């Protein structure tokens, strides 16, 4: 499944919930490979902007979510193989966070970067 990796380096965004890094076109077309069932990001550019942030630190190629220490460090050991940023800065809208909590999905920030 090449649908979980970028085709070019322009307009790349990172999913604020699972740190998946895809082109905004990929997010618009096929949605998030790990959050579309809870977000329904397919075919909605505005919702893609809301849930994915263009600004992130680092790139990590992930192949063995069940056999990677970096998967444990990044808490991405239950996600699909793809291009995963090291730190994704941002926060979801409050309504989406409450919707996830009502569904039962706890929202943990991916911004693991040390501030000051």
């Amino acid at each position: 499944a090449l649908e979980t990796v970028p085709k070019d380096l322009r307009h790349l965004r990172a999913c604020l919930l699972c740190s998946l890094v895809k082109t905004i076109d990929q997010f618009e077309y096929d949605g998030c490979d790990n959050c579309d069932a809870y977000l329904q990001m397919k075919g909605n550019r505005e919702m893609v902007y809301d849930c994915t942030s263009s600004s992130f630190d680092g790139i990590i190629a992930m192949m063995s979510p069940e056999d990677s220490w970096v998967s444990k460090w990044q808490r991405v050991s239950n996600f699909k193989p793809g291009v995963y940023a090291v730190s994704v800065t941002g926060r979801l809208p409050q309504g989406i966070v409450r919707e996830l909590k009502s569904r039962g999905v706890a929202y943990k920030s991916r911004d693991t970067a040390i501030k000051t």
Partner: protein
């Protein structure tokens, strides 16, 4: 980078000039900056910092458009109440070592 803080444009005719950080974009791509223009109002082109004269640039004509105190001139240059309020890239300005002297504080 803080709201109402002061930065300096790296390049352009406003290079090394003190510009107030009027607004910070949530996307962290650009910032709206307050500046005293350095423009000839299209009279000299076929400059020191001066208050934006809406009447002068309207009389000179050319690429100009006013909404009131707000004006769009010379390729999306935004001005308001004699002061430019234009968005500039965060990589196009220096965000440290900038402090207004008293003259810049009076200016902004």
């Amino acid at each position: 980078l803080k709201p109402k803080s002061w930065v300096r444009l790296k390049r352009g005719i406003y290079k090394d000039d003190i510009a107030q950080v009027d607004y910070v974009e949530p996307s962290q791509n650009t910032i709206s900056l307050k500046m005293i223009p350095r423009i000839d109002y299209d009279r000299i082109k076929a400059p020191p910092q001066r208050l934006f004269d809406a009447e002068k640039i309207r009389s000179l004509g050319g690429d100009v458009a006013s909404d009131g105190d707000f004006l769009i001139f010379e390729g999306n240059r935004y001005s308001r109440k004699g002061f430019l309020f234009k968005s500039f890239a965060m990589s196009a300005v220096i965000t440290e070592g900038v402090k207004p002297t008293l003259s810049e504080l009076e200016k902004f």
